[PDB]
Amino acid sequence: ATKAVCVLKGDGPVQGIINFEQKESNGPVKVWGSIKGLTEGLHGFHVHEFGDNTAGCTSAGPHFNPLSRKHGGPKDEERHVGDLGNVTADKDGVADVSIEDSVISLSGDHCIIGRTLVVHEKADDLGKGGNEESTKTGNAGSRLACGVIGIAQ
Amino acid sequence: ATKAVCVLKGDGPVQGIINFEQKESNGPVKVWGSIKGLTEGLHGFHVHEFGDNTAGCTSAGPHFNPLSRKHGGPKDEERHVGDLGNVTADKDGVADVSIEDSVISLSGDHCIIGRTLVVHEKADDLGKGGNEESTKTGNAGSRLACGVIGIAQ
Ligand SMILES: [Cu+2]
Ligand SMILES: [Cu+2]
Ligand SMILES: [Zn+2]
Ligand SMILES: [Zn+2]
């Protein structure tokens, strides 16, 4: 039973705790928790390559993309490993997160431990948008909060 | 080849950036950087087991100790994998960190990526303090600052 956790913090009001659980080697990873201080609507939700917060969320670099694919949504064959789609915040500015993903892992070459979880300014268009930036970043804009994914008890 | 980084944060502000570099997976790890906001003198400096900062540095748990050994200094055969001894702060409260260690790793069973680096209130006695706590924590007292160790570019 592998477990991981991530504390999301930024320069503004966005703060979250996100938990990961993977029962089996090469089984699905359950992703859950809560993020507050968000604007109502969709916020892009990604694993970025580097667990580097030296200069804040910008230091995490691009989407975690070990297989050199284009950007997409979690349900797409063509996605980055780190493509976890959107979280949705209500009028209270809270996003309840309950995700299962079979592309991320907590071990092996898809391992996300020691990488950065990022929640974004805008919606991720899941690569289905009307421009080139769709198929690199999903046009989710700035990084509102982030943290390094750590091994949990 | 293998690089890692950690941002230390805590009340003071106690603020640090610590870099890790391991050319070879069978090779030593160079650990360098700077921590400010410390009291002049020795501060214990350890890798703790969990990369969990959900409730602060307390969430990181005990020293990283995959081989079930007693606490020691970095030069000791009998040590926790996480035992990196002390950093030393100047009268300006700055600890310049320059450490080479052959027991921590950035891959394999002694991998410290996704675990928590902690700088402590007091000196680590490197397990030579006599009392029972010396053999467990080095009597280094509270956790002033910590962060999760992430993979770096
Ligand atoms: Cu992202
Ligand atoms: Cu410690
Ligand atoms: Zn992507
Ligand atoms: Zn120890």
Author numbering:
A (entry chain A), B (entry chain F): 1 to 153
Sentences from the paper on this structure:
Mutations in the gene encoding Cu-Zn superoxide dismutase 1 (SOD1) cause a subset of familial amyotrophic lateral sclerosis (fALS) cases. A shared effect of these mutations is that SOD1, which is normally a stable dimer, dissociates into toxic monomers that seed toxic aggregates. A common property of ALS-associated SOD1 mutations is that they increase the propensity of the dissociation of the SOD1 dimer, which promotes misfolding and aggregation of the resulting monomers into cytotoxic species. We postulate that 2 free cysteines situated on adjacent monomers, Cys111a and Cys111b (separate by approximately 9 Å), could be cross-linked to prevent dimer dissociation.
